[PDB]
Nucleic acid binder design. Structure first.
Lengths: 262, 143, 206
RNA sequence: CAUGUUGGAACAAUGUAGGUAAGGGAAGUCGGCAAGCCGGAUCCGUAACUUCGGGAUAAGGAUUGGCUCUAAGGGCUGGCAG
RNA sequence: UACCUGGUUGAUCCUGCCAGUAGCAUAUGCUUGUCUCAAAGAUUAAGCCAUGCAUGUCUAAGUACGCACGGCCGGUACAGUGAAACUGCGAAUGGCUCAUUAAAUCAGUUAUGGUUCCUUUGGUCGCUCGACUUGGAUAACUGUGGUAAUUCUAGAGCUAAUACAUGCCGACGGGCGCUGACCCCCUUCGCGGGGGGGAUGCGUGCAUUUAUCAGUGGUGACUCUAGAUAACCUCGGGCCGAUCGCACGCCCGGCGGCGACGACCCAUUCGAACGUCUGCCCUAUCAACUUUCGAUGGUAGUCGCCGUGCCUACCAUGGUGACCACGGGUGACGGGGAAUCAGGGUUCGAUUCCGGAGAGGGAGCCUGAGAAACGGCUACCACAUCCAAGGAAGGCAGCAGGCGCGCAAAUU
RNA sequence: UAAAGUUGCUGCAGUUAAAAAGCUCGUAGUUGGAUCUUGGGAGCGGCCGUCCCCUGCUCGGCGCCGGCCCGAAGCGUUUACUUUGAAAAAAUUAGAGUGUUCAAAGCAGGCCGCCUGGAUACCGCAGCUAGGAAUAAUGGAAUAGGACCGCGGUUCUAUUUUGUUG
RNA sequence: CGCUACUACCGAUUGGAUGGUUUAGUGAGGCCCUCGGAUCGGCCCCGCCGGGGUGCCCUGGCGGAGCGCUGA
């Protein structure tokens, strides 16, 4: 341990890939990139297990080295590229666009969208910076350092950016009553409206988030990602729309699914 | 009065060679709402490690303790007293982890038995990683 | 080599530590620079993260700032007078940070001649026969002479600095680290700090 | 004061009184007799045993010249100056 | 399944152990048809190793004049392949073992506002008055050789680059801060006076130092991020592009697309590193310990990537302990865990996941972003190999396998 | 390891089976009497059973004309205790679904391209946080160097304001 | 008290053998510092004269130093 590690053990992999242990010792250690090792999909996992285009790892080699896959309108040919939250994956030939959005359970959903929906994506601001000659910079959650952003776009706001240009199309400020997605902790991938953010100076701030069925869960400010205003989001939402229906209520629907459609 | 030492004691913020026809002080507020005392603004003392007049940033753990020893130079030994739980014998046992805290001379009148609320900062010395942020003296108060 | 570890020595209680690992590299000590005053010699070190660190073994010409009048000039370092830490760093004329030196006075006297149109030093009756410097003390207009006559009221220097211009050498204090930067940057002493270091020089000598 | 109550010239043995010896080092001898090693000071360290006083300068180690420097330790005169 | 039974007596009731009873995980004895999972030289010797392998690498995109091949017949150099070999990245991951180590390792929790970071990713890459390709070696090659011997290298003769070097056209016309010949203008009795225009020379953008006008934005809180002015720019130098090939089209010697490679710096990602709080097994036949040769603080430096007695000079006399310090032992790597359990506990955890440590014992370092690296070197110390006696060479606690050791553990 | 209630916290023994120091003092350690907002109301459930109270002075309205109050936020004796939330690698264990032909397992599968899982708990202590205020610690005025006041002065620095200009 | 068998104990021997830490002495090798200078290139004014501007001179075929200064 006298330098950076290069392997990842399949047992000690992030839980929300769902990798069966009896296959191999190792998992796809994601290449360094715009998102963290824990909270990202690598490309091979998405294109092998979830879609079943590839049976093996040499097949995602043969797919990516013909360069049909374009992540965020940029042609990525690295099988272990970390595609994190709100990163839009586009297959140009198939004509399908998939946004990576968290599921009800806290896994990355196979959520398809329109080509209209593909051209733009939302990015949470991580910090603002003042550049080399009073140039306001602005770093997002996917390392996008946009320069000359609007003076009202501050620290924890969310910016709709176009992919062709990389400029800010529109923005949403951190308002109590806006929709948001919890992107970590126990409440991972639930949509709700902000009621209060508890101010604790020094330590982390906690936000109280209420989903549409009328259920109040709290989380840290680190995981909350504002996605719209009031009742309507700016993004397509997946099936369920992050309500988190409980284990008894899931069995009540799984009953009716295999009883009615049989 | 001050500067009994080999090198000139001053602050690295102020400049004290203005041209003529009461040198100013460098104070700051510490954060997390702590009242910076009058003695750290009207005072004359130079101290490198003071969190009001000197250079140190308070961040991390705010602890409390009761003062034990005051024989060092601008340093004191406080006592933290707590109850370790044993699961087998479903009871507790008295322990203590007495620590060495840096005391700024803006706390002019301190005796033994006072309750000091101390803040975590970078290592000041070998075994000093805390600064007294307020002093709260025990029962009595007068004689 | 030279370990900078905190585990080779005793605990707070006064018990002997056991080493769980041997000397690591990131625990690193290089020998000192001991930067003497001579014709400029600087070596370089390849440090952690493939960066540079300039080992000034000798440097003669520093860069000192007159903070009061506000003029910074690349000036000659001449003689060491005081060192707070070790008295053997004044015997062996080394250059460390916060070390008191005698710098050349002529690049500041030149600027005080130019900016104010006054002299500095210059003994009673000692006037200039070759006539080069004294052409800076005369011949303005009758309205840009009036520009200079605003500067002259708020001109007069500190009387403790007057002597360090006539002798031709200024008490200066180094601010940079010659071992680390390969430089002897500092500032000229004036005010209370000057009076303090003048006493501590004068105290021993006698 | 005039070498101890005399001078001169030689430099044999054997003496008395000093010294030094390669390699070994008590084998010599009744017996280490005689000679030799150790030796002052400053800083370390110091056993068995003991009548607790000692043993003890136990045993065993290191340093020591010359020169040029620095630091600390004081009096008299009306936290300072001379 | 919250359980007991035999044994002291002539006989009885107790205390009390001994012995039975069930699981588990090591060895071994006897016995054996099918099928499915499957631990395995940990305990003793972190003992010793013959032999073989375990780390190499090229796309259209740094460098091909090997005919080793080869398409073309005569093309303004170069078709395509191509061993070398030089470049530049990897070899610091993985794998093995558990020897050391008892607030150490490690676990949860927090700090980096106290640092470093190859790569990936996104920024910035004509902001700086200030040249249609520039030097001269060197490997493979060729030809000569030396020693018994090594993945030993010498002398000689060529030639390349994204290696090693050196350097400027362009943007470029100016803008901006001092310095100032002289210029516009009257006031009042000419001196004083109230504002402007300007012939100049200089300094010019992010690193070291010191300053205030200040403080465009941010913090729980900065000596923060930016802005302004005066200098400095390390010959062991901060960049400021002499690199490469895809399609080559526009226009009358200029313009232009699509990408590699490269670059000081900023922000990421992977981390690493030092610190915060709390937590461990037996021991008083270990009660006081630390400090002159740093022990705990103050101060000013040195060094380091950074905070700090980390280290050096001056000071101060502190620091810890019956709430078990200090010293010692451990068949002690720590934890996630495992066996057994009515409930509470007792014992185990070398062992595939995380963190640590070491490569026969110690010590030292070169290169690199990152080793104090051992399938890298340099010494000594044990062991031990080839020798023509002059000298070379070696590190299986990697995979197999052999010896030894044992109660104890697999196919070169 | 259980049986071992033959190491005992739950949970053992000490007159005679093994065992209370010869006696008292005494420091850590451990443990420490009682005492402080209780009743009763109030509307609506069906004589009884819940909600709310013996607390205060930056910012929006259902507004009226130097102001008559409710809505968001800086605040109010300290700690233990309990309650919930945050945050907590998988694997293992407990467990949900699923006919590996059963099972131990594993993470898959089902219907004639579609549908569908890959949950969920547990994760002692220590730290973080917000309710509750019984129990147990702890604080305040008794040389009044007291709470509430409205008053009268002693000094320093911004801005609401002095027609530009000092 | 007398026989056998086994296990611990004291004990002259200034006993013996393995480790572990460590005081002194000597101290290999690496690293830094002050030197060093085996060697290998620049550059210059002259000489024989070219070659071209008109003896100036742009570059070269050569010999020679005070090795002049300078680099590694």
């Amino acid at each position: 341990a006298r330098g950076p590690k290069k392997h990842l053990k399949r047992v000690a992999a992030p839980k929300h890939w769902m990798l069966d242990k009896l296959t191999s010792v190792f998992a796809p250690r994601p290449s360094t990139g715009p998102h963290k090792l824990r909270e990202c999909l690598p490309l091979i996992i998405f294109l092998r297990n979830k879609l079943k285009y590839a049976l093996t790892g040499d097949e995602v080699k043969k797919i990516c080295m013909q360069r049909f896959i374009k992540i965020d309108g940029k042609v990525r040919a690295d099988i272990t590229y970390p595609a994190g939250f709100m990163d839009v994956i586009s297959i140009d030939k198939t004509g399908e666009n998939f946004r990576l959005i968290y599921d009800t359970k806290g896994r990355f959903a196979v959520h398809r969208i329109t080509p209209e929906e593909a051209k733009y994506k939302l990015c949470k601001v991580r910090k603002i910076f003042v550049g080399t000659k009073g140039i306001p910079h602005l770093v997002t959650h996917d390392a996008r350092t946009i320069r000359y952003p609007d003076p009202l776009i501050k620290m924890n706001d969310t910016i709709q950016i176009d992919l062709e240009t990389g400029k800010i199309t529109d923005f949403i400020k951190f308002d109590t009553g806006n929709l948001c997605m919890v992107t970590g902790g126990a409440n991972l991938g639930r949509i709700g409206v902000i009621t209060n953010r508890e101010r604790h100076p020094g330590s982390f701030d906690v936000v109280h988030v209420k989903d549409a069925n009328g259920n109040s869960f709290a989380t840290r400010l680190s995981n909350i990602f504002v996605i719209g205003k009031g009742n309507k989001p700016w993004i397509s939402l997946p099936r369920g729309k992050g309500i988190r229906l409980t284990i008894a209520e899931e069995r009540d629907k799984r009953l009716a699914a295999k009883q009615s459609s049989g | 009065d001050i500067q009994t030492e080999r090198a000139y004691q001053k602050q690295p913020t102020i400049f004290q060679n203005k041209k003529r026809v009461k040198l100013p002080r460098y104070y700051k507020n510490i954060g997390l709402g702590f009242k910076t005392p009058k003695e750290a603004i009207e005072g004359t003392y130079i101290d490198k490690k003071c969190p009001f007049t000197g250079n140190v940033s308070i961040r991390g753990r705010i602890l409390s303790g009761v003062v034990t020893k005051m024989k060092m130079q601008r340093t004191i030994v406080i006592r933290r007293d707590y109850l370790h739980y044993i699961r087998k014998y479903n009871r507790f046992e008295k322990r203590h982890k007495n620590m060495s805290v840096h005391l700024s001379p803006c706390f002019r009148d301190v005796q033994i038995g006072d309750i000091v609320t101390v803040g975590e900062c970078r290592p000041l010395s070998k075994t000093v990683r805390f600064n007294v942020l307020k002093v709260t003296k025990a029962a009595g108060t007068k004689k | 080599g030279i370990s900078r570890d905190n585990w080779h020595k005793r605990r707070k209680t006064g018990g002997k530590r056991k080493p769980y690992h041997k000397k690591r590299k990131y625990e690193l000590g290089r020998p000192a620079a001991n930067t003497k005053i001579g014709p400029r010699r600087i070596h370089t070190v390849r440090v952690r993260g493939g960066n540079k660190k300039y080992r000034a073994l000798r440097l003669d010409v520093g860069n000192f700032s007159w903070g009061s009048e506000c003029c910074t000039r690349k000036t000659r370092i001449i003689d060491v007078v005081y060192n707070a830490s070790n008295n053997e760093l004044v015997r062996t004329k080394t250059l460390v940070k916060n070390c008191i030196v005698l710098i050349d006075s002529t690049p500041y006297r030149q600027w005080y001649e130019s900016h104010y149109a006054l002299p500095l030093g210059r003994k009673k009756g000692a006037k200039l026969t070759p006539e080069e410097e004294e052409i800076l003390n005369k011949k303005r207009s009758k309205k840009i002479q009036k520009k200079y006559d605003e500067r002259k009221k708020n001109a007069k220097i500190s009387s403790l600095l007057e002597e360090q211009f006539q002798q031709g050498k200024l008490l200066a204090c180094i601010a940079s680290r010659p071992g680390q930067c390969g430089r002897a940057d500092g500032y000229v002493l004036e005010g209370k700090e000057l009076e303090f270091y003048l006493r501590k020089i004068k105290a021993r000598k006698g």
